[PDB]
A paper describes a structure:
Alphaviruses are spherical, enveloped RNA viruses with two-layered icosahedral architecture. The ∼70 nm virions are composed of two icosahedral layers with an inner nucleocapsid made up with capsid proteins (Cps) and outer membrane-embedded glycoprotein shell formed by envelope glycoproteins (E1–E2). E1–E2 heterodimers trimerize into viral spikes that mediate receptor binding and membrane fusion, while the nucleocapsid (NC) encloses the viral RNA genome prior to the glycoprotein envelopment. Alphavirus particle assembly occurs at the plasma membrane (PM), where spikes progressively assemble while enwrapping underlying NCs.
Particle orientations were used to expand symmetry and generate the 60 unique ASUs (four E1–E2–Cp subunits) images per particle for further classification analysis. Due to the close agreement between the models of class average maps 2 and 6 (rmsd 0.59 Å), particles assigned to those classes were pooled together and further refined to produce a map at 3.09 Å. β-Strands in the E1–E2 ectodomain and helical pitch in transmembrane (TM) helices that were lacking in the initial map became evident. Our ASU model reveals additional putative residue contacts within the lipid bilayer region between E1 and E2 TM helices and Cp. While E2 C-terminal tail and Cp interaction was reported as critical to virus assembly/budding based on mutation experiment, our structure shows that E1 C-terminal residues also contact Cp. Our atomic model reveals extra contacts between the E1(1)–E2(1) TM region and the neighboring E1(4)–E2(4) TM region at the q3-i3 trimer interface. From the contacts of envelope protein and NC in virion structure, E1–E2 dimer 3 in the ASU contacts a Cp molecule that is part of a NC pentamer, while E1–E2 dimers 1, 2, and 4 contact Cps of an NC hexamer. In our CHIKV ASU map, E1–E2 dimers 1, 2, and 4 have a single linear density in the hydrophobic pocket ∼17 Å long that sits below E2 subdomain D and runs roughly parallel to its length, and E1–E2 dimer 3 in the q3 trimer has two distinct pocket factor densities with the top one equivalent to the ones in other three E1–E2 dimers. The hydrophobic phospholipid tail of phosphatidylcholine was built into the pocket factor density of each subunit. Additionally, our CHIKV ASU map has unveiled distinctive double lipid-like pocket factors inserted into the notably large hydrophobic pocket formed by the membrane-proximal regions of CHIKV E1–E2 TM helices.
Author numbering:
A (entry chain G): 372 to 423
B (entry chain K): 111 to 261
C (entry chain C): 343 to 439
The structure:
């Protein structure tokens, strides 16, 4: 039980830290008016539904 | 007035949100719900690093917005209260022209396009340096002088 | 103690509570490594106390515990790549302005 709980918490933390990576690396392009991310970064980050 | 909307908390106006291009620019440190009810419905991807909240404008009804530009050759620029001078890297105003509540007002060039949006200021003598949110190509760069309060 | 001389082999008997045998036999100042897979007994209960020492402590599981190492290494690897990505993003964002 302890091993499963810790492993699930660790994978969840990995996902969350991945999520925090998207927010901090995509807001500078999202905040700029009339901006467009480069092609390479568009591939890497999964957040592409909103073309902001 | 044109394309800037006042933002108020209760009856007290705190700041103004500009419609630059395709974004509803607005500075984070102001508190308000915007005068327009429809704009309040939008979801803002706010960031504490740049003190900004922005969202996609409803281009279906508000496609009319201020033009923007990225280059800032040193010289003179105009906003609501007086005119401002790009002092080789700093936005400077006469001390009177700055006052809390002006946060969120844009600034234009000679050609009439926004180049920044003001947040606060600090004064060394008669002139007051400005804390603005300018932008280069596809990226914004917050600029802040020493000891600048938030308007 | 046993009697040894020549170029032959001997035989011993031991009692363990481990599922996988892993132990060193001190044979007249020269150690040796022995390893085998132990199997469960057939009789539920007996009339004498256990000859071996005690219950294996939680440290000593059975080989083919390598599953534990595999899964913990996978999770640690995922966490490591997540941390590296986060820290490189934090450094590049620190480089801004
Ligand atoms: C795909 C999935 C496949 C994966 C397979 C899943 C594997 C599942 C299984 C694992 C096996 C678990 C079963 C082990 C049970 C053995 C029994 C046991 O374990 O009991 C041993 C003794 C007897 O019990 P007692 O009540 O008489 O003792 C306590 C006395 N009382 C109560 C007064 C405190 O208890 C003790 O003495 C224990 C004393 C405390 C010992 C601390 C342990 C030391 C390590 C700590 C962590 C540090 C990390 C180390 C990593 C280093 C690597 C570099």
């Amino acid at each position: 039980s302890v091993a499963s709980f810790v492993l699930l918490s660790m994978v969840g933390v990995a996902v969350g830290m991945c999520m925090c990576a998207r927010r901090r690396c995509i807001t500078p392009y999202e905040l700029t008016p009339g901006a467009t991310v480069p092609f390479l970064l568009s591939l890497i980050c999964c957040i592409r539904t909103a073309k902001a | 007035n044109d394309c800037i909307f006042e933002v108020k908390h209760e009856g007290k106006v705190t700041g103004y949100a500009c419609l630059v291009g395709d974004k509803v620019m607005k500075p984070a440190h102001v508190k308000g719900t915007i005068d327009n009810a429809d704009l309040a419905k939008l979801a803002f991807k706010r960031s504490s690093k740049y003190d900004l909240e922005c969202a996609q404008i409803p281009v279906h009804m508000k496609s009319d917005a201020s033009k923007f530009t990225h280059e800032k050759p040193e010289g003179y620029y105009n906003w609501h209260h007086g005119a401002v001078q790009y002092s080789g890297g700093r936005f400077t105003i006469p001390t009177g022209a700055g006052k809390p509540g002006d946060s969120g007002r844009p600034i234009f060039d000679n050609k009439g396009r926004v180049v920044a949006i003001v947040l606060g200021g600090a004064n060394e003598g008669a002139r007051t340096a400005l804390s603005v949110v300018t932008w280069n190509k596809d990226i914004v760069t917050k600029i802040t002088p020493e000891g600048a309060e938030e308007w | 103690e046993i009697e040894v001389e020549g170029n032959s082999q001997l035989q011993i008997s031991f009692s363990t509570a481990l599922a996988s045998a892993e132990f060193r036999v001190q044979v007249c100042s020269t150690q040796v490594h022995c390893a085998a897979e132990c199997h469960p007994p057939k009789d539920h209960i007996v009339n004498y106390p256990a000859s071996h020492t005690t219950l294996g402590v939680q440290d000593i599981s059975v080989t083919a515990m390598s599953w534990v190492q595999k899964i913990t290494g996978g999770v640690g690897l995922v966490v490591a790549v997540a941390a590296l990505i986060l820290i490189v993003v934090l450094c590049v964002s620190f480089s801004r302005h």
